[PDB]
Write an enzyme that holds these catalytic residues in place. Structure first.
Site, PDB file in Angstrom:
ATOM      1  N   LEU A 135      48.190  13.899  59.610  1.00 12.21           N
ATOM      2  CA  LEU A 135      49.189  13.049  59.926  1.00 12.21           C
ATOM      3  C   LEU A 135      48.857  11.276  59.987  1.00 12.21           C
ATOM      4  CD1 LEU A 135      50.864  15.105  62.830  1.00 12.21           C
ATOM      5  CD2 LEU A 135      51.746  15.018  60.520  1.00 12.21           C
ATOM      6  N   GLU A 136      49.505  10.458  59.271  1.00 11.74           N
ATOM      7  CA  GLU A 136      49.040   8.846  59.518  1.00 11.74           C
ATOM      8  C   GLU A 136      50.213   8.390  60.199  1.00 11.74           C
ATOM      9  OE1 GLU A 136      49.706   5.137  57.222  1.00 11.74           O
ATOM     10  OE2 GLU A 136      49.635   5.268  59.499  1.00 11.74           O
TER      11      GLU A 136
END
EC number: 3.5.4.13
Lengths: 161, 161, 161, 156, 156, 156
Positions: A135-136
């Site tokens: 996840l960014e």
């Protein structure tokens, strides 16, 4: 072969249970508070794990996407992470995914984080993809923003034939 | 008329070859390294061209989306561009697109750039759209980030009836 | 039950008129200039209302998405809002939405704003959702960017069975 | 051993030794310039170098790059927030072998977050002074050509 | 009542009273160090503390946190844009009960947007001086260990 | 021609000429205030103006806008990173026709990236001094009302 559409909870469930598509898997909304996780009508609410990479300009390196550098970020582990203003964090989902050859998965945020300026920048999982999802979270606000480990962080929408 | 679904490689190919939907067109993954381009199972990986507009606050103008200003940005041409931290760049795809009256196209990033904080902010191509696509790359990291001309930069997903 | 596809103008119209899905509703492109609003071939162009929340770091609070704070933002009302560089704004659509149990809605930007560095960060409206939509506009440019009340601001794409 | 000289001494040195040119023996003009009780208010010229991060270079002070800034010429300059500007004084200075000159800001600019970052002029120095205006505010700030921009204090 | 002392007085105090150690009676070396006409150019040591917002703490000056900065050691330091650095002088100082010492920047760094933010050394103070370099430019800027970094002016 | 005056001279002028009010003849209190060997440490009052870019105005120093800052009152202020604050001294000053006053920071704040940007008080000036604290660090920094905030150095 065959164009793809957004698939419903019962299809997501069958793929999780028979094909190991999502693990661990909870077949309903779970967890206390607004950041719930688990199966939704047309997607799956995944959880943030507790290992974060927080980016900072301390070492003054031009980032090269072809050559990752350890000096772009600092490692943090804990029950929450604070994303500095105008920066971003990388963290993994708790859930492991095994995406069939037959499926593409899109990632969206949860409104609880989006209304704080957090943009989830996670590109689609291609057919055959296997892994915890990285996840960014880009913090687009001028203030630090707190994110919660082991709670809901994003929703995956499953496209299939 | 008719709701739309994500279309497969073979459909994208036929539209490229018979209807000029994508040009130039490569019917498979091409190019060296992680930033490959060309047809994918459920989309098309387009390439960045070598002309960039890099935005900066040097001239202190309030940007008005109704009235573009030349002083918001500086022109750069070359084999790569560095996006300053917390800023953005505009650049065109190498590929020219001719989108049929029957089709809407969504644009997504490549994970190689997304995990560096690069958000691709390209709104959907409407039916009938014709042109090189203007790519907007927002650098959400606090560090400068290098992007590569003539290599893969985004993926287009084609929705049709 | 039933996978979902992007629905056309005539379906959006019927749901607006018979089921109150969008109100007020205009069944065609309206309004002067590039920021038009109303029904589109495969979506609905919604309007920005005139009440904005502009975020700023003035009070030095860590934002907690579980506990909103009034000191994260300043209220503005008017015919336009300027989003400070590298910050964001919250504002509501003019349109009220009533999303059927049968439908999920995705929100995208308008290219007029996206090419100025404005990222629309609005997560999908779930089936059964009812309300004015809270638009989150992140300004990813290093310059202030002007946004226009009562004009088009985003497009909603309707997925259904 | 050196003390801060009064107006009359700056007056004598400006006229009899061309220490400051052009020279005005009184405040002319919030942004006055000319002779003060214990110093000299110099004027901003109208050529500016505005700094920006557009080209992503590490500034090397031993090898200063053209791509760090943009040239601007005009009646005013707007300094981007959290950046700085370089400009020259209108006045030319001939600092005697005898004297050291310290530079301070004017309250009108300082009050807006503008820090003047001008290191002392050593004995025997000759030239137009490079003014460095650092904008420490989160807002762009306007500065005016041909009007007062700093005060020099003369030690002898 | 105190005035800025000349080189010969700094020379005498550095040698006969160990006011500055080590001491060099002339410019050695754009980034020279040692005795100047009316002051002393000290050298940057090679240990740096670079500040960053990584841990999202409000800095309390009464309770300064380790998580506000990162330690770096080397021949140079790059100061992030719009941040600052702490470092020590190579030189040790023994300021007599007699003297007050003001610190100014070198033009080579100031010209790049580096502000030296070093408050006066009070009579009787002894130590390596903590230099605070604030980078007011929007670009990272390089600073050099073992070379001149500021000038001290001695008032007595 | 003007030199830096000692404590005893500041003492006499504060009492016999009301140069500083209120006046304390010694350090009271890391953030002490009052008479120092060669100057006077003044106190921060508790009213602050914190600057922010919320309203997207170019600051005109000739026409300073209310929408550039937010008013705050309290025992402390937190200065946003890369911004600044305006506040007044607790002390009132009556600078004689005779004297010029320079303002420097305290090491406790400077060490945190706070630059005091206060231009000299000219002969004959009377008032509470406007302190300008520029936060050059990438982190917010806390400052304390009613405690020492800067030192004034009196030249005569």
């Amino acid at each position: 072969p065959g164009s793809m559409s957004v698939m419903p909870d019962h299809w997501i469930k069958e793929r999780a249970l028979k094909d190991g598509m999502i693990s661990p898997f909870v077949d309903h909304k779970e967890g206390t508070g607004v950041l719930s996780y688990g199966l939704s009508s047309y997607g799956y609410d995944a959880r943030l794990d507790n290992k974060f990479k927080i980016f900072a300009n301390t070492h003054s390196v031009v980032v090269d996407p072809k050559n990752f550098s350890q000096d772009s970020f600092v490692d943090r582990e804990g029950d929450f992470c604070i994303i500095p203003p105008n920066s971003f964090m990388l963290a993994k989902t708790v859930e492991y995914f095994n995406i069939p050859r037959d499926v593409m998965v899109v990632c969206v945020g949860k409104s609880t984080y989006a209304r704080c300026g957090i943009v989830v920048n996670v590109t689609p999982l291609e057919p055959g993809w296997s892994g915890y999802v990285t996840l960014e979270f880009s913090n687009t606000s001028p203030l630090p923003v707190k994110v919660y480990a082991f709670e809901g962080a994003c929703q995956f929408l499953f496209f299939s034939g």
